[PDB]
């Protein structure tokens, strides 16, 4: 008997049902209460200024035409009937190429209750557009939005809500971090209005707050560039008669900074300005450049070719431009690290 | 009413032929267009294209969809666009494009009571524009978007920008990473092909490349390596192991700049303005090491048969000629 009643309920719901028109097209607005469960805040692409997110995207609204009376109170539907029932045209305002999964069946469920309330969830993969301000790279933090709303229906036709308190609506899974470069600090849920050429739409908004971990860039970029500058200052404690040695020591630290400037440059999208790591490399390239101009000034005032033999004619003296540069250049690089790591670990 | 609205719409699409143009034997239909650009995603110099996300909207008057009694603009489902006549407009620059289909296919049909119809589309197109990169990276680029009717000629369909010059919006909100939009323009004209004369609309930008990226990476170390090649002029000629190890390591550093920028800059195989500066700086590094062997051959090879004069001469000429080379370079490409 139950297999006969259930098929006759699903036949009489679609009699006279026009899915082309909104529930209450001239009567009232359609309050669509939305709800998001984030299962993986996927990998954020810095060079594309985008990120990926896997959601169970829930929707709930009331349709008067789908009331029924039967044995059960809630129905479950195959998606052939979910394509015959009206569905709000939610799109993502910053989506780039998002995927509605259908393995192995289309991952959608539509549930009718006896009073007409529809529950419509889907499993999505949304590739959204996150604008980034990389002036403080890598010691920066930016909020990636996930903004959605109706496509054709204005504020006078379809209004979106949340199914509960807005901070409790967007839920992130505890094991669903799935980030390796950033650190998901928490989300913020809000709601807004666009002024399009067609009309005013209701926009739900979720911002995900990300702070970049800088432990990779210290070992790969900062510490070899610090230790190369420490090298090019250590040639000051060599004797002034080491004319091949302090030349060989000087230019090879420049080629080492040239090697480190290339590999640090590849791990960055091509912004139009100086990132915070680029302020560090260009100044560290200047301490290595100026350490060889120091030896070009010492060599101009040497006046001899031989050095101090260990058993003792007249000899050279340790120059004033060497004894000053032993004090000046480690200090001006030490003062620069105090200015750099306090300006950018404050912002 | 709500049940009356179904009976109104069902008799609009009863007997409606989607194969026929509106006024199929009469006047040409006038389609007015409207683009709300969401974002210009990336501008690639290798593939010679740019990605464009936009809200592409079209308005035309259809007498077969005139409904009376209902004082509201019927905004229907997106699936009724498969049961109407929509224009067959395309893009000539279009390499690859798609209408967004999450959560549904992002279309709209907003009927009006006089017969006016809006058909919006959120399209992410990859439009192709060729670039004159002979002034890279000090260049301006003009990338277009051509909009044309495919089958219908200018006797069947007619295009116009709806709103005049305020048709395309959202260009001032675009903040490209390494470019800067100077001015966008709107062009309406008719183009004759081998089949007929078709109407064409053109949206076209003017991209100016920002230069702060390439000074820190490409120009400034290539300058400071040439200056370190001049250090072998204030060193005595007897320092053979010192004056060689400057200029030999200096031609190696210019090699590792040029070869690793070839792997870092976009690969476009012809001669650019950055290639002539890096080859131009490589010569001053190459000539400064020729200066020592010209000194080393005179004192020792043609010695037992002036030496300080050539080192004194090169301290003035090579900083002057390289500053003269920058004056030729930074005035020709600016």
């Amino acid at each position, epitope marked *: 008997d139950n297999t006969t009643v259930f098929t006759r309920i699903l036949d009489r719901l679609l009699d006279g049902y026009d899915n082309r028109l909104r529930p209450g097209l001239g009567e009232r607005v359609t309050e669509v209460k939305t709800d998001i469960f984030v299962t993986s805040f996927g990998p954020v692409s810095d060079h594309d200024m985008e990120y990926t997110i896997d959601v169970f995207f829930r929707q709930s609204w009331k349709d008067e035409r789908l009331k029924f009376k039967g044995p059960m109170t809630v129905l479950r539907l195959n998606n052939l009937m979910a394509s015959k029932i009206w569905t709000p045209d939610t799109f993502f*305002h*910053n989506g780039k190429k998002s995927v509605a999964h259908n393995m192995t069946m289309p991952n959608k469920l539509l549930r009718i209750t006896e009073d007409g309330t529809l529950l419509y969830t889907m499993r999505l993969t949304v590739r959204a557009e996150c*604008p980034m*301000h990389l002036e403080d790279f890598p010691m920066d*933090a*930016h*909020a990636c*939005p996930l*903004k959605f709303g109706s496509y054709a229906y204005t504020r006078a036709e379809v209004v979106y809500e949340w199914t509960r308190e807005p901070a409790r609506s967007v839920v992130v899974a505890e094991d669903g971090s799935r980030l390796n470069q950033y650190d998901l*600090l*928490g989300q*913020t849920v*809000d*709601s*807004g*209005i*666009v*002024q399009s050429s067609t009309g005013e739409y209701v*926009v739900m*908004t979720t*911002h995900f*707050h990300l702070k970049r971990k800088i432990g990779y860039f210290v070992i790969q970029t900062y510490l070899p560039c610090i230790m190369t500058v420490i090298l090019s200052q250590v040639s000051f404690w060599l004797n002034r008669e080491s004319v091949p040695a302090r030349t060989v020591f000087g230019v090879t630290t420049v080629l080492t900074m040239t090697t480190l400037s290339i590999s640090a440059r590849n791990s960055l999208p091509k912004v139009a300005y100086a990132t915070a790591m680029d302020w560090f490399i260009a100044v560290c390239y200047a301490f290595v450049f100026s350490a060889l101009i120091e030896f070009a000034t010492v060599n101009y005032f040497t006046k001899r070719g031989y050095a101090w033999d260990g058993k003792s004619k007249t000899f050279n003296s340790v120059s004033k431009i060497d004894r000053l540069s032993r004090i000046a250049f480690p200090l001006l690089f030490g003062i620069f690290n105090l200015v750099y790591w306090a300006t950018y670990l404050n*912002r | 009413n709500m049940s009356f609205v179904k009976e109104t719409v069902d008799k609009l699409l009863k007997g409606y032929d989607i194969r026929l143009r509106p006024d199929f034997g009469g006047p040409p239909v006038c389609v007015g267009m409207n683009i709300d650009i*969401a974002s210009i995603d990336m501008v690639s110099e290798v593939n010679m294209d740019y990605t464009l996300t936009m809200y592409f909207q079209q308005y035309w008057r259809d007498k077969r969809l005139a409904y009376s009694g209902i004082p509201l603009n019927l905004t229907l489902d997106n699936r009724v666009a498969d049961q109407l006549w929509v224009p067959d407009t395309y893009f000539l620059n279009d390499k690859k494009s798609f209408v967004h289909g999450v959560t549904v296919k992002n279309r709209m049909i907003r009927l009006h009571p006089d017969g006016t119809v809006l058909y919006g589309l959120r399209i992410t197109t990859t439009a192709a524009c060729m670039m004159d990169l002979r002034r890279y990276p000090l260049d301006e680029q003009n990338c277009t978007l051509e909009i044309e009717s495919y089958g219908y000629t200018t006797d069947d369909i007619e295009f116009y920008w709806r709103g005049g010059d305020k048709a395309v919006t959202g260009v*001032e*909100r675009i*903040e490209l990473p390494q470019f800067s939009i100077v001015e966008h323009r709107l062009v309406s004209r008719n183009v004759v092909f081998a089949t007929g004369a078709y109407p064409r609309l053109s949206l076209s930008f003017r991209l100016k490349r920002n230069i702060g990226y390439f000074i820190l990476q490409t120009y400034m170390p290539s300058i400071l390596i040439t200056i370190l090649s001049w250090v072998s002029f204030w060193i005595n000629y007897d320092a053979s192991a010192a004056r060689v190890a400057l200029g030999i390591t200096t031609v190696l550093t210019m090699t590792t700049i040029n070869t690793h920028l070839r792997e870092t800059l976009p690969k476009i195989p012809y001669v650019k303005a950055i290639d002539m500066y890096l080859m131009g700086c490589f010569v001053f590094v190459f000539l400064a090491l020729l200066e020592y062997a010209f000194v080393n051959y005179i004192f020792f090879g043609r010695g037992p048969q002036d030496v300080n004069a050539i080192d004194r001469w090169s301290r003035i000429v090579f900083p002057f000629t390289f500053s003269l080379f920058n004056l030729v370079y930074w005035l020709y490409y600016v």
Partner: nanobody
Amino acid sequence: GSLRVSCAASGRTFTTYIMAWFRQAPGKEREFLAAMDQGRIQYYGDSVRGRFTISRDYAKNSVDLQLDGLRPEDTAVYYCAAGAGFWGLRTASSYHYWGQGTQVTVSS
């Protein structure tokens, strides 16, 4: 009566940034009023929703605020904020650029 408080920026293109409007009565409480994002998305505080109208101009690098339906409770100093909202869009600690102040006085 209506009013239109504007905010002309300088020195930096704030198209990417969120340009907001705050409010501080005597009592030291920075209150959110409105904020428009880069994609022309109008956020509003629930006390001034439906009354104030924010409207950025992106070619001139400015943010406006169409004050309408004013009351003597709206008599305060209106700060023009700008910056990317990190833990933001309702919080003053996310806005790193600030306006001077505009004493809007309403007397019934």
